Design a protein around this ligand. Structure first.
Ligand SMILES: CCC1=C(C)/C(=C/C2=NC(=C\c3[nH]c(/C=C4\NC(=O)[C@H](C)[C@H]4CC)c(C)c3CCC(=O)O)/C(CCC(=O)O)=C2C)NC1=O
Ligand code: NA
Lengths: 172, 162, 162, 172, 162, 172, 172, 162, 162, 172, 162, 172
């Protein structure tokens, strides 16, 4: 996997080039915005259980056929697996927030996941809905103005939203 | 690629865990050090050409037989001298990449893996590249923690060649 | 025990390597954060008794049936109340240990391993301990990065119980 | 393994006690001296190859019977293994410098190492001499006043010397 | 799914053998017991509704705070009460399936796998479901070996929750 | 795998339903016919070697090209494997007789077996013939009126024939 | 492992002897008492959780030093392991009740268990006390006259007590 | 040793479980069948000598060359005939052990393991022992389920030799 | 297939090495021995029919019951005699293949793998084939190292049947 | 794998035939030419390093884009792997020279190698060129008239050339 | 240690087999070649001193900087020259051992294992030892198959250094 | 393991010495006697089955208590294991004949074998007797003057006897 810094390095090596000043400048701003990134990870991680449970509750309220007998989330084994998947997707999204790059998410979570759910008969569009609900809770928690030095985190919330939408697109 | 950030993630991922405060402190450590590292990387990049030219000559001075002896492994032809300068620039470029990424990763992947097989096969002496690296170290002109940073990765290459 | 320092070592040792700059930055990150952590740990230690007494009452307030219902799992006897206060102090003590060590290690080893087996066996409800922990979080009286630090480990316990 | 911080915690838990102010104070000074510790590791590590090679050279100069035919360091396989051992001991000593505690050295390097060398017929007292030579080079490098903010590192050099002497005692 | 018959087969198949007299006696044991099991399953099925309604009330009686406390995990709304009745019927239905199949298989696969993760996640107390199960056990009205049969699988669920 | 009882249960759970009286009645008759099923397994199993050997003899008598040099059953390694396969198919058929359901046969023996023989160049239609010969011997042994309480086992012999024909269809 | 029947067989084979009439008679009475044995297993097993939990409660009430900080059952990891051990011993005792012989208990549970606890620093005499408490609860449950055909199970309760006392002696 | 009881235990032990109703039905199956098995074992034991003497002669009748041909593998000396009678009694004794234990275990452990190596090494023909076993089967004089029982284990030996 | 040449290669390939002088000496050993082996193979091939006819009769002489006893495993029909002659020719043909390839490979792959399963299943006595092989050995008419060669592979078959 | 001798045997067994005199004669000439084959292997093997290194040098001289940044042989890891592949192909070709048959080369080296290089993005036609250069050096070394009993090895050099051309065709 | 004889045994032992004719031909190959090998080993042993002295000078001639440059790795002191002569004699002695044992074993175990680690650590250039070895090869004065033998093992060392 | 040649080499290397003329002469005679050694291996190996079976027959004739019920060779599993052991010892002895050195026998067969039999309750002195009987048959076969170029093999038969006596001493 790559972080934001290693990605610039790998692109540079392919051309056999030292970094430019534009690239150094871009990477410096990445470092100057680092405190915000650490808060976002800390906050989303610190509320991981409620994000999952509350999103799952909402999903089953809107799609009751999932929990009816014969549904894909009926039985405790299937429910456990469903909640587990939500936890995993969230986990890998937080990894990508820390690294500032989606490679870890794409490579270790999303590659082949659509195919996985198709073989099982798990409705991918239902999974997408679960991810979208976790997204909306995560951004509300991460971007909460209470209990933190005030400032603008909007470009980071855009980036965070980017990682969630990528995962929802990957399964749907 | 090995950086303080991918290491923090690998640790968590290996144990199936979310990131903890254990790992966030590690990444903050990297963000704070980045100022010294970027200073080093910038200076080495801006002064790259003189450092490469100076370093190659340091090598020819120490091992004069490299400019006289017949064979494609030596710098006794224009082609050989150009290959030597190229390689020395590769070393320097890898150091700047390490500085930027905050770890050995770039050098580990692009230079050190396979190194001893390459040097053995083409009859390239490690001590040539050590001398080149010692010149860069003595003459980069950095001070304080920028020097500590650049020297850490230069010395890393030296131990890989030793 | 899991700390930023033993993690840095485990990484190197696993790959048979000396420590690199990758790992030293991680440990510096921990040393710089230690000031906020030690502030948190000290304040929580000095105010331990009031936080434990307040927290137990918060639990009895939220779940009044715990003070009335017959059974050794409940706090409807002097013995039950003393066991409850003990456990809540264990939770708080583990948080101070995490703060001091700079990681989850102490809580991971002494409290979280085996937790769900214990709660299941003795019929102890996780939501009792979550309420206790939320009280400590709301009333520790820390601000800035000391609060961030203490809250990180309190919330870690909460997710372990959830 | 334990670091200096986890060791205080484990002693405290055995008594069921919150940390005292004396313990908090001791641990604060540990943190305030942390820059020195990082320099010592960086310096010893950065010179790892010359420490080993130069110590080995010296050892074979003083004990030539080791490299004579039939000697325990005769043949390239045995020489390689000898140099490897020196590298390993050095590596684990540097781990203990970083952690501020010998547990990693004792547990993962020294436990059973005397017995190992006795079964092989490797002279433990020769190994001890090799370690003592690495010690003297390591402290000279780590405590070199050139190229660093001046200050007193003597208590740390004592500690470093402690880890080397422990390893030499463990094999002899 | 685990039954006396699939176990007999699994044993033979694992060792690459034809069925022996060892395994046929096991299956005959199951066929003879089936009369007591089917009696139990039929009676529990015919009286299902009253047993579920009675059992839910037993739970509300023992833990009155479940009908008053705010939260989606509790039965203080129509929705919560309907979910509770549903779950209790799931438990009873699984017991009838065990009785019919002659083993724990159905309960093992459809209810017990994942159980503690579910109860932990949605904040459902095991002791609620134990009380429900004890009511069914005391009031199923079966005697002799039909009672032994039904009680064996009910108590199996209880140990899974304990 | 499922037995006859677990199959009814799994169909019921998919609908979220208690068993009906029709289903209870059907399963009761299954139990009342259980002595016959145990005799059939015991008898076929007790004669397993002669069923195989006699079927193989017959097959090679009718299809000599199988044992000519270059034939798929020429050489002792290939003959052994051929007889082994016949034993395996018989074994799995007896498993399905005991369970009253084909799942164990289908899942652990027949799935992918046509493809297996096609990759090898083993003639599937020859295998089918071998199975048909084992079938005819098995039913004669299982339905022999000598040495057993008289009664009607015809519906069970139909079922047994069903499992053999299924295996022959699976390879042909 | 042996059951009561296989043990008689193995003793007989060592002498190269057919069974006597005395041995056949003894084994017949074993079979005639089999319903009682199945009740005892069913009852002890059906109450496994309360036997363990109630015995552990009692143990920690009488030996509080076990749960004080620094005690061998302090921390949830050590408590879990303690309860686990109690479950295991109970499990293996029930195995021996079913088989009518201690070999499974001795061979797979008790062999080397004293040595195990001595290396750990677990007080064996405390473990013995835990087993004795499970014994007293198990016999009360197994020999409860309510809800069962009346008759005498005293020789079986003696045997059951035998298996518990054997385990307590093995660790103490 | 393989019996219905040790199999029931092995299953539970392998999965780390207490015994369930699944396994108790298996053992009851064995207890009920024991009456037919013990009848068979007793009759075979009481009539052992005539069955062994009859069986050996059946073999000499079918394969007359075994009483004439020179070699220690054959029964053309007193010693050879005594070894033959011994072996046939071993077979019969193993059948009675299977009947008593309720499974193949005794025969599996004491006779079948190593059998083909023994017969190959000492030049003993399996078809001699099959003929001996078929005689016992035709002439044991048991009826009903006692015959079913004895024949199951005799035929088990026959397939092992085939 | 196992020959001195494929063994030499397998050794090198297993250790990821080029061929060495170690392995070339092995293959030269095979080339020098080939003269004795080819002599043996040629003579056995030219005299194949008489050796097969003689060998079958040797078997019928030693074990006369094979020409009289009813059953498809015996040579008491035209079909049985033709199958016997066929098999004996298979044995001889395999010996010539071993001689040509310089190793056991051909016999190992085409005859010995599965042998004991075949003989056990069709009730074929190994001692029939040993007698056939001993006849060929006594009457092949080879001398010196050609006899040593042919006898080595014949005796190899005998130990496989013993 | 087969050698030249085992291949004749396997063809013969498929027909159920003893060898003819033509086949015996062909195999005898194989043996009489064996000294030449052993020299060829010894010579090519004894110069293995220079064959590889000199071919690689030539390749990178003619195709510099391979070693430019972003090239498939740029970086020491990729260069090492490239040289390794050349060594492997050479190794397996020498195996086939010894055996007098390509089966070992085809089966253990060439099968699937085109697909391997296509997945990686390694230019197969560049690999082919590397093999052709090793071929030309190998034949010059093997067929050098200095330091060896004079005689004609031309049919063997044809065979050797055959194995190289086969490998070059397999990747291109 | 790797010889044609231990390889023949290892093969058999690995597959749990007795030795076959496959393996005996390999060992005969070795016995026949031993005459050429022993001739080579004897001549190299008798002329050892002149070959070592000549070879060291060949190295000093080719790489004159080895006799002038300061450092313990070079031969610019009496001690350095004596170490160089020693090492060259080690190489020659290993070749004679290979010749005697009929394989690479002695060189593999005593010299090649660890070689690249040693040369890397003490800054010893492989090309020094290649030149020494090429001198011995050109000037050993052996002809015919004795030269083939000695050259095979010398060239083996050269590829190990390349 | 070592052969006779590698043993001389290893002794020489320990002293750092080239071989003497005495050593070269000794090794030359080893080679000149090689045809005899190959005959001995070929002959013993070619009769491996009769050596074992005939020795075992004799052993059980002289020590009938081994095959009585309760004896260590009673039951087919124990008989198989006994014959297997005899085959193994013979196999390893033939390995040592080929190599001209006992290292393979000592290292891979005899080390720890006394201890093995003591733990099992197998009488070592009975095993010794079995080996002595195989020895006497092996030497009679190997030294048979029929069908071989006449000459003296007495020093080799001494050596062969040496390997058998070593194995018998190792277990007794
Ligand atoms: C699925 C496993 C299984 C069980 C559980 C089982 C139990 C079982 N125990 C029985 C009887 C019995 N059970 C007991 C046992 C006891 N009575 C007492 O008063 C003692 C306190 C107690 C000590 C255990 C007695 C005395 C009998 C009657 C005698 C007998 O049939 O053995 C019977 C005979 C029918 C009956 O009497 O109701 C059955 C079916 N059978 C099975 O197949
Ligand atoms: Na037992």
């Amino acid at each position: 996997m790559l972080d934001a810094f290693a990605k610039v390095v790998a692109q540079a090596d392919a051309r056999g080039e030292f970094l430019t000043n534009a690239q150094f400048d871009a990477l410096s701003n990445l470092v100057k915005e680092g405190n915000k990134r650490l808060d976002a990870v800390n906050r989303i991680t610190s509320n991981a259980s409620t994000i999952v449970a509350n999103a799952a509750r909402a999903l089953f309220a809107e799609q009751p056929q999932l929990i009816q007998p014969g549904g894909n989330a009926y039985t405790n084994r299937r429910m456990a697996a469903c909640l587990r998947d939500m936890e995993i997707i969230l986990r890998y999204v937080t990894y990508a927030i820390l690294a500032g790059d989606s490679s870890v998410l794409d490579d270790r979570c999303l590659n082949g996941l659509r195919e996985t759910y198709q073989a099982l008969g798990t409705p991918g569009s239902s999974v997408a809905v679960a991810i979208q609900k976790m997204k909306d809770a995560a951004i509300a928690i991460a971007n909460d103005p209470n209990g933190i030095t005030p400032g603008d985190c909007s470009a980071l919330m855009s980036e965070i939203a980017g990682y969630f939408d990528r995962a929802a697109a990957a399964v749907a | 690629m090995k950086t303080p950030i991918t290491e923090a993630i690998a640790a968590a991922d290996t144990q199936g865990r979310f990131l903890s405060n254990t790992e966030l402190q590690a990444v903050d450590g990297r963000f704070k050090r980045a100022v010294a590292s970027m200073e080093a990387a910038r200076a080495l990049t801006n002064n790259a050409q003189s450092l490469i030219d100076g370093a190659a000559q340091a090598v020819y001075q120490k091992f004069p037989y490299t400019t006289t002896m017949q064979g494609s492994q030596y710098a006794s032809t224009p082609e050989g001298k150009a290959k030597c300068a190229r390689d020395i620039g590769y070393y320097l470029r890898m150091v700047t990449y390490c500085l930027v990424a905050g770890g050995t990763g770039p050098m580990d992947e692009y230079l050190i893996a396979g190194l001893s097989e390459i040097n053995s096969t083409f009859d390239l002496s490690p001590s040539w590249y050590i001398e080149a690296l010692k010149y860069i170290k003595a003459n980069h002109g950095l001070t304080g923690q920028a020097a500590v940073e650049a020297n850490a990765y230069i010395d890393y290459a030296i131990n890989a060649l030793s």
